[PDB]
Design a protein around this nucleic acid. Structure first.
Lengths: 96, 78, 74, 44, 81, 36, 49, 78
DNA sequence: TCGATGTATATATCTGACACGTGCCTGGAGACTAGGGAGTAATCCCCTTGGCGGTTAAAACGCGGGGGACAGCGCGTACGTGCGTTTAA
DNA sequence: TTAAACGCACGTACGCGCTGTCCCCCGCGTTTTAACCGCCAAGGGGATTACTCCCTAGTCTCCAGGCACGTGTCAGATATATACATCGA
């Protein structure tokens, strides 16, 4: 048989997704999520396709940055695995 | 309850874009709370601005106003 | 105040000398800057202490300051 | 005492700012109670 | 030059606007615009493309410390990281 | 509050309810801060 | 140039325009002057940029 | 120049003690001095710019209040 | 260490986003009456800069010794790579 | 109806707690520098007022610059054959 060593594929995925620029969350599931969330504020609300597209772009751009910040305070402990306390610390330091 | 629509592969892909090599099994349940709270805080403002105009259709510029008030100016939608 | 007044006043006039010559300062402007600096440094050390505790250490070290500033985006 | 006297004018400027933004966003020539209420709902 | 003056008068920025203001503001905006496009065009040539796209704007802005300092909070749609 | 609203050039016209509401909000928040 | 790049440039120009007009108005209010001159714009440019 | 040496060790120790630091490494002092220098430089540059626009010769508290407000921190009492 | 996997290149073919031309219209430009905000000039007088005498608060330099940080080893069980099942977009 | 998520067991790498050891925070002491208080000099510059003018707001005329609409074509695209780079037992 043939087999790649653990961790070699992870680098290939990192190199792949940082070169491309398409959206990464599924369009329909995200749209359904926005539709369900909006129902808590007002009935019979309507959303243009570009409003949901704007929300999607905002969420993907925010989460990528949050993971980038969390990785530094995860590595600071001389680890490679990121864990909940790293996110909690990054969010506490950002004051949000 | 559509929050389960945020599947594990999508979160892994986002973390991959951020350069994370190894991901703990607890990150998945941690991310959902962050995303839900962010979306609620953005939508409340967008709907408030849309209501100010007495319109019934939310428009992209209302969302731009919501993000701008929080310091998250978005370029690309005019 | 906790920083000596006279040295800080001389520090202020030294910094100001790089921008414009023969400048003059009111008695309250220097103390205002002193209050600002003391609050800023207290806040930075408070933030650095969490980064130090994160490694289960007791001694705070420069990398904790650099990390806090890098995450803060300064 | 000066702290409170600054705090009051600061919040005044913040609320009046949001009321002005609400007016400009609709090209309205008059600020009304609806603008103040929306500014309060947007800030608080 | 006229549009700047009209927007100033209609925006309530001030009750009166002098004659020299619009020429100065137009010169500033033109300078910044030429600076942005020159770099975007260089990045496009460096990518063997012939049409500029948002990705080139992101790459040009994030590689300059001054533009990046001015636009640190701005998010570019379809720009990515 | 009404005078500042007119002098600040926020709009060319100011309704009578706007300054009353703004003053009431400022007083409420001021008391809320002073109490805490 | 693609249509989207021009679309992004339009928001870029509207942003910087509003920043400069903002600072120029604040400076004029601070000095208690009724009009905007090249001096106010120059000061706003030097402070924001 | 050497005037920067006026920020003595005991003052930094007192500040760190108020910040809850239990043990302090001997290398923290030079980093604190550099951070303080850059903060002062930026605030003073803004203050001098406002003073020069008004054609004044004395620097007053208002130029400092406006500089601090621009950097994103509000000081009450001046 | 080379050969099994993966991503890059050179080619023919393709279709719909863009560069260009048109009619026409609403805003910009040229001329005037008008007037008040703003440039210049002068005085009053304060408060900032420069200096002196002196008395102890705080900073300075030793040195003693033990709390802590650090490199190292062992082990146990979490998450990574790949195959098959199956779900709804 | 095909490619997306969901599930499975295997297994090598990581996270975690133990020790041994030497160095450099902390504390007490004696000394010495200059922070600070109070009093003396004196002139550069801030705060208010009046003269009077020349730059900008409001009303009207007329025209050519720039908004909607239509055209048609070539720059970017999947798809192919395959090239050669990279990783492992």
């Amino acid at each position: 048989p043939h087999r790649y060593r653990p961790g070699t594929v992870a680098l290939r995925e990192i190199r792949r997704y940082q070169k491309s620029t398409e959206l990464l969350i599924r369009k329909l599931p995200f749209q359904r999520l926005v539709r369900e969330i909006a129902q808590d504020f007002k009935t019979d609300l309507r959303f243009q396709s570009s409003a949901v597209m704007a929300l999607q772009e905002a969420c993907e751009a925010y989460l990528v940055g949050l993971f980038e910040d969390t990785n530094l305070c995860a590595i600071h402990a001389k680890r490679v695995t990121i864990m909940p306390k790293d996110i909690q610390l990054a969010r506490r330091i950002r004051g949000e | 309850d559509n929050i389960q629509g945020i599947t594990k592969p999508a979160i892994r892909r986002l973390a991959r874009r951020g350069g994370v090599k190894r991901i703990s099994g607890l990150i998945y349940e941690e991310t959902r709370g962050v995303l839900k709270v962010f979306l609620e805080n953005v939508i409340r403002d967008a709907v408030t601005y849309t209501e100010h105009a007495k319109r019934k259709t939310v428009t992209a510029m209302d969302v731009v106003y919501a993000l701008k008030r929080q310091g998250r100016t978005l370029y690309g939608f005019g | 105040l906790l920083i000596r007044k006279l040295p800080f006043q001389r520090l202020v006039r030294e910094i100001a000398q790089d921008f414009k010559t023969d400048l003059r300062f009111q008695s309250s402007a220097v103390m205002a800057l002193q209050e600002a600096c003391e609050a800023y440094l207290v806040g930075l050390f408070e933030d650095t202490n969490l980064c130090a505790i994160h490694a289960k250490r007791v001694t705070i070290m420069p990398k904790d300051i650099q990390l806090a500033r890098r995450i803060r985006g300064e | 005492m000066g702290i409170m006297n600054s705090f009051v004018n600061d919040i005044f400027e913040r609320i009046a700012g949001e009321a002005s933004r609400l007016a400009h966003y609709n090209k309205r020539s008059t600020i009304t109670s609806r603008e103040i209420q929306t500014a309060v709902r947007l800030l608080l | 030059v006229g549009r700047v003056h009209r927007l100033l008068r209609k925006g309530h920025y001030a009750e009166r606007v002098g004659a020299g203001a619009p020429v100065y503001l137009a010169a500033v905006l033109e300078y910044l615009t030429a600076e942005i496009l020159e770099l975007a065009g260089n990045a496009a040539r460096d990518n063997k493309k012939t049409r500029i796209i948002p990705r080139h704007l992101q790459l040009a802005i994030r590689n300059d410390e001054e533009l990046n300092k001015l636009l640190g909070g701005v998010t570019i749609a379809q720009g990515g990281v | 509050v009404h005078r500042l609203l007119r002098k600040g050039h926020y709009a060319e016209r100011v309704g009578a309810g706007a300054p009353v509401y703004l003053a009431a909000v400022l007083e409420y928040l001021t008391a809320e801060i002073l109490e805490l």
